[PDB]
Design a binder for these strands. Structure first.
Lengths: 185, 239, 260, 134
RNA sequence: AUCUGGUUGAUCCUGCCAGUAGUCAUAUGCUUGUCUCAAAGAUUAAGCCAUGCAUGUCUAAGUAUAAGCAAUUUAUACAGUGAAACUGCGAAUGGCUCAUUAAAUCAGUUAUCGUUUAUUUGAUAGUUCCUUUACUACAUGGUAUAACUG
RNA sequence: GCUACCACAUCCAAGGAAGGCAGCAGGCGCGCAAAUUACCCAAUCCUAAUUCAGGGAGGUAGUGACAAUAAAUAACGAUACAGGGCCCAUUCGGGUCUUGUAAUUGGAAUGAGUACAAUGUAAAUACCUUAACGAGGAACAAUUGGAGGGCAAGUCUGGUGCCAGC
């Protein structure tokens, strides 16, 4: 034998499948941000609905209760460090009215279009996938990075991509090898 | 049956017998012999190993139809040829045949890196996708562990053979000698083992390139029978 | 089964050794020796999971066969010899001397000591009896027997042992207000002093111990190891010195110390 | 063109096997994966030792080029490095030769049939040379 | 912390049958490009089994006249290496299955002032020729067998 | 490990002699129902007279839509013709837009795949890195299930009821 390897499932579908007032607000997020399927939106409601449950009972036990103070001021501290809670909303009741696009506005697909690198929200997810953008020194290629707050200011192009750096791709090299040698013949 | 003209089936035999755990069976049987009778002292079975001559073609066409397992060799340096290799494959299956094993002798010729000797197997699967959807493996006899379950299956199985050749009786010869009965006609002693259903003294026997000849007696040597006078019309145009 | 068992599986290994749960399938099983099974630490968990000197099992046997590693002034080559509490591990080709003693969160700590503290060893007193031909002896917690003691020694006291000749210098009694180490249970590794000790006839006796910051707790009698009189131990204590810090107090004490 | 920069981090002095072990970190912009022949001959002059007394292993190149991290170590004599280092690292370096035996299946079956002969077996040879002679 | 369709011409009820989601819950149908991690002859038959393997072991330190090798040399008892065999230790661990078993197993909890224990670690043994040194060795008693030859 | 009876079944010169896969690979049996007769002791650990020998225990691959995580199958222009559109509106167009489409036209990006090297590894295979190669993509082409009601989606044409309970 050996030890077993833990895993977890990360989303959850909803109870009523075909009812129309749900189906549109999911649609207007998938066109606003450009997400592939609605499994990507269930992924952000799961993660939210365990944050909300975690604060939902530290509120029940008393104040000046040392489990509220150790597990509270860490949950608050992690949400600000990625930049979802506002810096003036550092109180535990304020996380109970958090919303689902306050995480959706921190992905790399959304934080690169706002910071002036791509002309549309679909020019982001194809710029990232093809290894062009590199926070720090690291080419990432995941459209759901959830950028930390003190590293919003490091995003740029890559020191290998033809856009922000060296040699052109194998169209322009192929076109230069289609015309410059063909200038004599 | 080799499927290209430059092959050493005696060496393919010596790639089939190195994994048999005797040693003194291959070296003494080399000079000019095409029939072999060998007893396998591991799975406790005896084999009748034959090998025809590629210079003739007609001998190839009946050495299949005596047997029940046909070892189909392939090549690791070429593909098959149409008029001679592919036609002789199309020959035997259309006249009817029992089961068979496709196999490759040598895979030294492709370069000693591993992945290049992998896919050349997949190329050699080509004549078992449109010919037969009933056999998916090709056993590499250079591998010792692939060369053993090619010995497991022929010593321990027997397939559905043909219909018509089975239900009449057929003997292969082992010792043929002529003895004298008359200057008009003598006698041939034939030593062998009867396959099929048997041979009885009320009908005739044909051998190709010699034709039809009349028996006289039957003796089983570890049942002495004779030919009665109930013969048929031993002629061409019966009156 | 039919005889003794001889393998230890990986998840059943004792937790405070901190073997990672994916590298293999079995753990080292400690040999039969001076200290108990789940209260000790073999010489392979020391020399490759603490000091990081060796990278294999095959490297540890290459160290032990060169006759470097001693315990208590005696050479060992058993690759799972069971070193336990208060043992002295004297390497030679580095001139380092170690002493096995407890951490605060419940672990066996790396501790370097001098070249003069490594000449002796404490040990408590598990029983005192009258042997054959009328001589008495005394049994320590690691199993040393020593004949001819002073008569004033009783059980649960503490002796001091000289590792050279295997003999006694002096001893400490057991009463109220002494320095005490705690070697088993939940408050494991804390140091404090005796308030008083109540007794239950035919049961397990309880001591009450006060810290230095004056907060108290209770354990059974046998998890209590006397060290010295108040304010004066006989051994070199680790950092923290057996003070329990609450988890609130040790986040920010790590925060303000984070100035590197 | 290429700054093949060699850091050597977290060093430990090991006299119990007479060596130093350290984490090798190598920066190499605009190149793929500096080979072991360089990384062994580079470190010798940095530590003033023979080429044969150094060895390196375990190199993973980061996601997206540029560098590689791993391990190397070095003994203070070539007599020690033949004494302590595992013999498949020695055969990498052209230093120790490949032994050639049978496979693992052929020397299992070989010993199970020398479990049947009580002794040398020479007395058994003249027996079958008598009876199987006739 | 949620409900919708179906009894009557029409309405309120008791009431059940459809629907709706989940499954580390097994098969099955059509499809199937990438990276990481991976269960897998349990159910029915604790039914039957061809071939190969899974348990052996030596240090400077119990026994070497190999008619072994190396020869190489200070060595006339032996001394380098080293098959076979006696002696010592292990084979009671590990791995696999779930048939039996309902106060039994098993769990958390006690007891041995009611018992056996190879090993490991630490202590521990002037007294024993009839004798206090009288015949009868302590500068050291006796046969028997293995491998091997035939 | 051995010995008896019970149920089995193997070789035989017929005098006899041998046997237990609910260990690992593999069988022809059953059923709705479940992988290779492969490579090695490098790691994890156990045994031995012992650092050296042994280990289907255990590790590494093949077969694997059992389950779980990350996410390709297109993104940018031009004119064009439309409309809306905010405005210059005189009324034009003066700006800002948004689409709509124009087998209307342009150039850039890239890994699926292939493959020198190096790295990985006990040796290899693969993943990370990287020469040369690799697209208008019409072909490098997504599929399963439904379109009275419950329950998101059609007033559309064709059967003599070809190929009707549904």
């Amino acid at each position: 034998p050996r030890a077993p390897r833990t895993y977890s499932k990360t989303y959850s579908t909803p109870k009523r499948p075909y009812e129309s007032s749900r189906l549109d607000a999911e649609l207007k997020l998938a066109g606003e941000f450009g997400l592939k399927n609605k499994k990507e939106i269930y992924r952000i409601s799961f993660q939210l609905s365990k944050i909300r449950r975690a604060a939902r009972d530290l509120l029940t036990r008393d104040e000046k209760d040392p489990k509220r103070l150790f597990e509270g001021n860490a949950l608050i501290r992690r949400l600000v460090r990625v930049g979802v809670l506002s810096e003036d909303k550092k109180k535990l009741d304020y996380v109970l009215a958090l919303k689902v696009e306050d995480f959706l506005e921190r992905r790399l697909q959304t934080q690169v279009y706002k910071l002036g690198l791509a002309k549309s929200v679909h020019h982001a997810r194809v710029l990232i996938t093809q290894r062009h953008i590199a926070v720090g020194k690291q080419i990432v290629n995941i459209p759901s990075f959830m950028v930390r707050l003190d590293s919003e200011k490091h995003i740029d192009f890559a020191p290998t991509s033809p856009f922000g750096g060296a040699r052109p791709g194998r169209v322009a090299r192929r076109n230069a090898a289609r015309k410059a040698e063909a200038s004599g013949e | 049956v080799p499927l290209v003209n430059d092959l050493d089936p005696l060496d393919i035999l010596y790639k089939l017998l190195k994994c048999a755990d005797d040693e003194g069976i291959m070296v003494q049987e080399v000079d000019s012999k095409r029939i072999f009778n060998v007893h396998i002292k591991k799975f406790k079975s005896n084999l009748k190993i034959i090998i025809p001559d590629m210079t003739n073609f007609l001998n190839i066409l009946d050495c299949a139809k005596v047997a029940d397992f046909v070892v189909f060799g392939l090549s690791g340096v070429q593909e098959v040829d149409e008029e001679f290799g592919e036609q002789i494959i199309r020959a035997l299956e259309l006249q009817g045949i029992a089961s068979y094993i496709g196999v490759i002798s040598n895979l030294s010729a492709v370069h000693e890196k591993e992945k290049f000797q992998l896919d050349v197997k997949q190329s050699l699967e080509s004549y078992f996708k449109h010919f037969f959807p009933s056999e998916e493996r090709v056993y590499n006899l250079e591998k010792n562990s692939d060369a053993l379950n090619v010995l497991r299956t022929l010593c321990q199985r027997l397939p559905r053979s043909i219909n018509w050749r089975d239900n009449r009786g057929y003997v292969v010869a082992d010792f043929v000698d002529f003895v004298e009965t008359s200057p008009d006609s003598g006698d041939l002693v034939i030593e062998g083992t009867v396959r099929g259903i048997g041979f009885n003294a009320n009908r005739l026997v044909h051998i190709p390139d010699f034709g039809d000849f009349q028996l006289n007696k039957i003796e089983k040597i570890s049942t002495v029978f004779e030919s009665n006078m109930n013969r048929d019309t031993l002629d061409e145009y019966a009156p | 089964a039919r005889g003794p068992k001889k393998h230890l599986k990986r998840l059943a290994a004792p937790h405070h050794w901190l073997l990672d749960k994916l590298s293999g399938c079995y753990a080292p099983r400690p040999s039969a020796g001076p200290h108990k099974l789940r209260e000790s630490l073999p010489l392979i968990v020391f020399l490759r999971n603490r000091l990081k000197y060796a990278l294999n099992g095959r490297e540890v046997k290459a160290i032990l066969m060169q006759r470097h590693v001693k315990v208590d002034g005696k050479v060992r080559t058993d690759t799972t010899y069971p070193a336990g509490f208060m043992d002295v591990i004297t390497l030679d080709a580095t001139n380092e001397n170690f002493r096995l003693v407890y951490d605060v969160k419940g672990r066996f700590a790396v501790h370097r000591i001098t070249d003069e503290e490594a000449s002796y060893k404490l040990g408590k007193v598990k029983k005192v009896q009258l042997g054959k031909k009328g001589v008495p002896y005394v049994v320590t917690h690691d199993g040393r027997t020593i004949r001819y003691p002073d008569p004033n020694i009783k059980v649960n006291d503490t002796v001091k042992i000289d590792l050279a000749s295997g003999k006694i210098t002096d001893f400490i009694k057991f009463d109220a207000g002494k320095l005490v180490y705690v070697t088993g249970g939940r408050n494991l590794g804390r140091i404090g002093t005796i308030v008083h000790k109540e007794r239950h006839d035919g049961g397990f006796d309880l001591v009450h111990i006060k810290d230095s910051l004056d907060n108290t707790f209770v354990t059974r009698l046998n998890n209590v190891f006397v060290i010295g009189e108040q304010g004066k131990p006989y051994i070199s204590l680790p950092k923290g010195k057996g003070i329990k810090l609450s988890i609130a107090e040790e986040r920010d004490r790590r925060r303000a110390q984070q100035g590197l | 063109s290429d700054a093949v920069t060699i850091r050597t981090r977290k060093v430990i002095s090991n006299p119990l096997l007479a060596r130093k072990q350290f984490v090798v970190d190598v920066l190499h912009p605009n190149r793929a994966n500096v080979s072991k022949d360089e990384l062994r001959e580079k470190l010798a002059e940095v530590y003033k030792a023979e080429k044969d007394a150094v060895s390196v292993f375990g190199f993973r190149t980061q996601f997206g080029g540029g560098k590689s991290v791993g391990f190397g170590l070095v003994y203070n004599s070539v007599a020690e490095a033949k004494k302590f280092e595992p013999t498949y690292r020695l055969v990498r370096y052209g230093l120790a030769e490949k032994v050639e035996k049978a496979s693992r299946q052929q020397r299992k079956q070989k010993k199970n049939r020398d479990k049947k002969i009580f002794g040398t077996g020479k007395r058994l040879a003249k027996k079958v040379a008598r009876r199987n002679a006739d």
